[PDB]
Ligand binder design. Structure first.
Ligand SMILES: Cc1cc2nc3c(=O)[nH]c(=O)nc-3n(C[C@H](O)[C@H](O)[C@H](O)COP(=O)(O)OP(=O)(O)OC[C@H]3O[C@@H](n4cnc5c(N)ncnc54)[C@H](O)[C@@H]3O)c2cc1C
Ligand SMILES: Cc1cc2nc3c(=O)[nH]c(=O)nc-3n(C[C@H](O)[C@H](O)[C@H](O)COP(=O)(O)OP(=O)(O)OC[C@H]3O[C@@H](n4cnc5c(N)ncnc54)[C@H](O)[C@@H]3O)c2cc1C
Ligand SMILES: [Cl-]
Ligand SMILES: [Cl-]
Lengths: 516, 516
């Protein structure tokens, strides 16, 4: 079969230029890549939070080190997500916060530290799980950097940045390496009688043709949804939020510092993200239109940060779910054109480079073997649905009942058999999927991580944080006092590391300043 | 809940004493373990072949190094399985053999060497896959040891031994560490109205009681099948063989050497195993009674090795399949009481210590939370069904059509959706599950291996060996000539290692002799 030689990418957002960059890197020879993007249709970039695999899977593949791209996007460091007022109904006299931290939890004789902690709590141990099982939460409370002053890594971390800038960065990178950039707007898509994309008709009268089309046109799904009629699976029965009111809020970093984490502040009919950068933090009230009006949500958002009625706002709406098939005929959907999930766990950009990773792993020729796209589509389904369930697990697990929104999350959600099964195992006291701690190649081979994205530690951070604990500790531990004693030594070690971090880490602000 | 304190194991075979050994090791405190075995009911031990996880998962857990247990069981080294006359109808003028080797296949720019080999074959490359992608097949042809004379490991390996002796070894090991051994025969099992095992009535009038019962009574399933009425899922529609005629055959190792591998010699209505040890090799014609009589199979077996009509034979029969649930109420089935699969891929003893591993991971208290057994049962189902599909893939893939037996395997088998999906992906040219080569922690964390037992390399050895190749090479490779060039360097390196092994390895016989 003849190889794919001409590729057309529709879209100049984060998805489009990640696709252009990744493909021009992966396809070293025999690859003509063209990207068309409309100047009259804006890109989505609200100030985004990410996860560590952005470096390992995407930028490492491009050969771009962290020190190269991060200052070009005015990046800040992210070491966790802090959930505020998610556990109980808001009480100004109560400190309601917990962290979902990056990194793996140590194992002790084949059992994660989370389970040794639970047994301790049964006997009266008061300290919260993540403060016992991780070394960095207290450091995050102190708004400290994830690295020493000399740049030595001290904890797993990701990044906060304006996605507009990473698109510009990748634009310059990809164009320099041969990607043809076209500023124009597609107005019509022509299919043959078979149903394959023949050509694209633009606004300036250009006719674009290719062997392979990549749809990065955003939520509208110009190619995959509108032209190819691939149905979008609405999953509003799984998750309730469908809107957002967002803006940027100035921050006096000199006296307030820069929080080295994303915040998720539970509201009456949703939650508000806080994504710190230098000089400001991006913020957005994600809400359900069925429980609050955009007007009311706007008022709550302004009141939360004490913003004025003159503050410019980014009014957003979206549909939760995914296409039935991400790849149909000769068109691959990447980004918002493929799927969407509320930014509760920073999975948006992850969906992009994870899908691109899978596209190269299933790269077609001009014959377009349906076995390739079928396999690709199955991977996308697994990827999205797994993250959807993890996010949903934040909702039906909550104890809040103060508003109709939270009551609905507790009782009226549709749950997959998969997430029901995990929760059942968790409640039984069983550890979920764990990996080796004294190895960490889980982060080095993406096939492993892609198929097992969320581990025991991730779920425990969420569940224990929301106050939903297993019925009992592992029955096995009653037979292994030596293992229990060994776990105590590990807890003590974590406590010592936390104390060392407190006096060794520079503030996140000072470290970000040293990088200018 | 009160902890499990009294445990009764029924059975003194390989399963029973592995269970006794593993549990007395895992349950350091609060564990009274009793094993009852009948002296009038023999154990099954035909001379068994194993896989490397026996050391990593079982003996390492007991703290017993290879050098300790192997000479106690008169063990020989196994480095692969050689399949003879499986590809085509037997032709004495043709050499029909291929190896299924232990170990992982190297990756080159995210693609296994198997796929770079396939592309080469498309362009005329003649050398068989496993001889190109592995360094040791030629060494195995030369009957060389898997280690240097000084004991330095040179290739991944497992073991051949009489399972009777490993049972005796573990018996002595477990009894010395507190396991109570009872020589008697259970004649009646009493259940309460709930359906839980109350007590065991023996032949000498003893009444045995416990919190937890382990059924290692063999194929009869004294507790799980007969008492608890748990249905056995007959899978004769998946696999056709149901019988075996076996014996031991003397070998002049001084002039013939000792083959460092198990052989699988395809017959008219089944296949014959060859499991070499010092001084002899165990052998057994596995056959389907629906295509040949035991009498005819016996004659073929004797004729194959030139044995006489006076040669004592072990006439065996079995049912292929598994219990619907491995663990019911307060009874856990381990070994032949749980499931059986023909020894095509040496999975029998694997099923034992893998299940025991899972039992400890799901260890109950006296309340017996059904969530624990449900989770355990699901793992057993995955374990068996996955190995069943892998074994079955040897059968429906063959090109042989010379007998009704092989025609039936080609056309009349029932295939799971899972195996159909894998074959489809393979035929499309896609790599199956792969792991990191420059790491090998896949063999260090059993959770990983248990869920992903058979990798791309394993399937490729079987499929390419049977002459069933993908329709085409990976389309991506047409865009990456640099990766192709890089793979050539790896092939050259493997060729050099093979040449070094040829002149460096002692013969398997001489090395086994040096260990006496
Ligand atoms: C409210 C919100 C919060 C988010 N938070 C996070 C987060 O915290 N972390 C994270 O990682 N991700 C997050 N995401 C996701 C992420 O921001 C976006 O998915 C990503 O940055 C851009 O996706 P996209 O490029 O596919 O869509 P878009 O940004 O909409 O890109 C659309 C592009 O296609 C072009 N185009 C469209 N139509 C046509 C046409 N007819 N002809 C020609 N050209 C055309 C447009 O000009 C534009 O260039 C969030 C998304 C939203 C909506
Ligand atoms: C033909 C064949 C080939 C095989 N090849 C391989 C191979 O190559 N590699 C591999 O790893 N595995 C292989 N296996 C599997 C392996 O040999 C056996 O599964 C294992 O060695 C023994 O299994 P078991 O102990 O559960 O059953 P058994 O050996 O039958 O043990 C039964 C025990 O339960 C006791 N018992 C029974 N009944 C009663 C009662 N009413 N009261 C009291 N006590 C009782 C018996 O006395 C006996 O001790 C093979 C099996 C077969 C049949
Ligand atoms: Cl997101
Ligand atoms: Cl076996």
């Amino acid at each position: 079969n003849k190889p794919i030689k001409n590729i057309v990418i529709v879209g100049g957002g984060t998805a489009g230029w990640m696709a252009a960059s990744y493909l021009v890197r992966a396809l070293q020879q025999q690859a003509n890549i063209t990207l068309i993007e409309s100047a009259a249709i804006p890109r989505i970039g609200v100030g985004e939070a990410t996860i560590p695999s952005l470096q390992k899977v995407f930028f490492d593949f491009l050969g771009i080190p962290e020190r190269e791209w991060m200052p070009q996007v005015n990046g800040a460091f992210k070491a966790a997500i802090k959930f505020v007022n998610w556990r109980k109904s808001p009480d100004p006299s109560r400190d309601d916060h917990f962290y979902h931290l990056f990194g793996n939890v140590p194992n002790c004789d084949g059992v994660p530290l989370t389970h040794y902690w639970l047994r301790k709590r049964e006997q009266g141990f008061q300290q919260p799980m993540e403060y016992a099982c991780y070394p960095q939460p207290g450091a995050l409370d102190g708004k400290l950097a994830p690295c020493l002053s000399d740049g030595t890594r001290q904890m797993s971390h990701a990044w906060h940045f304006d996605a507009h800038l990473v698109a510009d960065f990748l634009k310059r990178w990809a164009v320099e390496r041969g990607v043809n950039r076209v500023v124009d707007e597609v107005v019509d898509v022509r299919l043959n009688n078979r149903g394959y994309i023949s050509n694209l008709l633009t606004k300036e009268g250009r006719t674009l043709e290719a062997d392979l089309f990549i749809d990065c046109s955003g939520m509208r799904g110009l190619l995959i949804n509108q032209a190819l009629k691939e149905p979008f699976i609405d999953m509003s029965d799984y998750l309730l939020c469908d809107s957002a009111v967002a803006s940027a809020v100035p921050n006096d970093d000199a006296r307030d510092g820069v929080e080295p984490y994303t915040s998720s502040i539970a509201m009456n009919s949703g939650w508000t993200w806080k994504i710190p950068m230098l000089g400001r933090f991006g913020s957005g009230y994600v809400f359900s239109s069925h429980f609050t009006s955009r007007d009311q949500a706007t008022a709550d958002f302004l009141k939360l940060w004490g913003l004025s009625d003159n503050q410019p706002l980014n009014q957003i709406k979206f549909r939760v779910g995914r296409n039935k098939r991400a790849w149909v005929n000769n068109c691959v959907s990447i980004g918002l054109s493929s799927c969407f999930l509320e930014p509760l766990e920073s999975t948006g950009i992850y969906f992009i480079y994870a899908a691109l990773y899978q596209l190269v792993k299933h790269f077609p020729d001009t014959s377009f073997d349906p076995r390739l796209s079928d396999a690709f589509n199955a991977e996308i389904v697994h990827m999205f649905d797994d993250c959807r369930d993890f996010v949903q697990a934040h909702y039906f697990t909550t104890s809040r009942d103060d508003t109709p929104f939270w009551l609905a999350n507790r009782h009226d959600l549709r749950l997959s058999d998969a997430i029901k099964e995990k929760v059942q195992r968790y409640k039984a006291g069983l550890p979920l999927t764990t990996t080796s701690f004294d190895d960490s190649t889980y982060y080095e081979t993406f096939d492993y991580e892609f198929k097992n994205k969320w581990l025991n530690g991730n779920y425990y951070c969420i569940f224990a944080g929301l106050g939903m604990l297993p019925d009992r500790s592992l029955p096995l531990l009653q037979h292994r006092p030596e293992s229990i004693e060994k776990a105590e030594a590990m807890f003590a070690s974590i406590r010592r590391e936390a104390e060392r971090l407190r006096t060794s880490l520079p503030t996140n602000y000072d470290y970000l300043r040293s990088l200018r």
